Amino acid sequence: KPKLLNKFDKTIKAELDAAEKLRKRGKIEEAVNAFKELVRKYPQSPRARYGKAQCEDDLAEKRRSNEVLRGAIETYQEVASLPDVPADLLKLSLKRRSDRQQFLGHMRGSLLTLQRLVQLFPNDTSLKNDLGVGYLLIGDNDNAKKVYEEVLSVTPNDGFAKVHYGFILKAQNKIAESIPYLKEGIESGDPGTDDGRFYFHLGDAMQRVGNKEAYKWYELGHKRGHFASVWQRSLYNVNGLKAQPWWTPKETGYTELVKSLERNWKLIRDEGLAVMDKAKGLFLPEDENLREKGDWSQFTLWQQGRRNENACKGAPKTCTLLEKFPETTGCRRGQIKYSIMHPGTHVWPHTGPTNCRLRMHLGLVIPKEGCKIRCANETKTWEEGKVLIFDDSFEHEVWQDASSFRLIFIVDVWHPELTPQQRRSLPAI
Ligand SMILES: C[C@H](CC(=O)O)C(=O)C(=O)O
Numbered sequence: 001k002p003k004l005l006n007k008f009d010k011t012i013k014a015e016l017d018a019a020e021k022l023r024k025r026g027k028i029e030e031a032v033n034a035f036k037e038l039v040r041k042y043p044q045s046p047r048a049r050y051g052k053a054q055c056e057d058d059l060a061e062k063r064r065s066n067e068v069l070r071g072a073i074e075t076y077q078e079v080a081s082l083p084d085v086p087a088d089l090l091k092l093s094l095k096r097r098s099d100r101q102q103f104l105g106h107m108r109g110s111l112l113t114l115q116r117l118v119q120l121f122p123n124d125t126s127l128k129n130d131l132g133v134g135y136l137l138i139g140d141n142d143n144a145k146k147v148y149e150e151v152l153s154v155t156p157n158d159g160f161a162k163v164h165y166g167f168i169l170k171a172q173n174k175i176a177e178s179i180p181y182l183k184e185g186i187e188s189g190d191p192g193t194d195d196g197r198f199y200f201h202l203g204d205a206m207q208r209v210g211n212k213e214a215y216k217w218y219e220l221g222h223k224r225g226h227f228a229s230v231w232q233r234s235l236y237n238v239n240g241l242k243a244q245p246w247w248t249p250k251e252t253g254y255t256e257l258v259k260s261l262e263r264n265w266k267l268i269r270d271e272g273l274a275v276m277d278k279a280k281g282l283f284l285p286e287d288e289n290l291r292e293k294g295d296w297s298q299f300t301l302w303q304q305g306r307r308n309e310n311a312c313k314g315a316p317k318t319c320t321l322l323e324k325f326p327e328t329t330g331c332r333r334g335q336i337k338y339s340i341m342h343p344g345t346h347v348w349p350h351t352g353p354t355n356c357r358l359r360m361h362l363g364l365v366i367p368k369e370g371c372k373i374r375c376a377n378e379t380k381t382w383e384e385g386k387v388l389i390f391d392d393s394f395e396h397e398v399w400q401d402a403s404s405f406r407l408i409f410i411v412d413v414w415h416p417e418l419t420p421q422q423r424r425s426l427p428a429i
């Protein structure tokens, strides 16, 4: 039902459908030459020009070629330069241009295309919504906010506009205000609203204002395929890995590493305390997004399988100990770090990025009351010289309500069901 042919193109239809059928057949290189061999013969036609670009676009996905695709992006532009081009075709070509610009990371180039589209079609709500995304992708939340406010003033129940507006409010620290927008947008069911990122932000906003319905939305997100379960919501996952929030050492099979950590725990503690005492600047403030209140810092020895040489000069015996255990030093999706937390601290519920690791905590200095960690529905506490093991792809939350500082040692390990070849080939995050 789209109209892609001006007065001209209608005359040469039998040819245009030929070059088109070649592409639908998958015989791409000929559609290209076919189309390419029609502008020299049919320079003025939009639909012929559009066809050449569609071919380049397809050749690009086939050949995995950015260079090819850059060619398509210009030919899509050429379509819009010709006379009496039909609105439906103008819109198709520039929209695809913007999308492929965005694919290459030409985010401001895409924004300029989308600005053009809105000038051409000042009443197409869909295109304003896309323009707002263009402003978000260059980091310009203020202009995106104005775009969606415009959309909502004309079409107040557009769910796409609502979920993006809620996201923008949340990023501006209007957390409570974002929630009804996210909810209503998701509930509209409109195209582009059934997106795990809006379930993520809705659930996070609700948890951060004490609303217990967050878990209803995580569960809905799960049923919609955005989360592994109501509790396990990491983004970068491998299928088939045992999924439980708390593990015993025997269950992980890394019993020799647990033994080494527990049996040498005072040395690990003492090296951490020495760095605290002498080089306290080496403890870096933890994730400010996750820290509701308090004072929480970390001193990293390994990051994604890469040893920090300057840090291992501060904790040399501990680094030496760990070098025996590639299940953690070679965990490209994990970290090895000391983690200190002072009284009055609360870490918001969150998950880690991957189900490919397990997270070990060795207790080094644990006040006798006040410190606890929840993973999923079970809350536990640390002990000096003992390891706890949890799957941090499950939601977890930490409180420090003691009267002195709490020091732990955090050791990530590859999930034990990952094969050697999987461990070798997984990208770091
Ligand atoms: C809050 C905790 C760390 C800590 O308790 O120092 C956490 O999120 C984690 O181990 O992943």
Ligand SMILES: [Mn+2]
Pocket (backbone or CB within 6 Å): 350, 351, 352, 392, 396
């Ligand atoms: Mn965490």
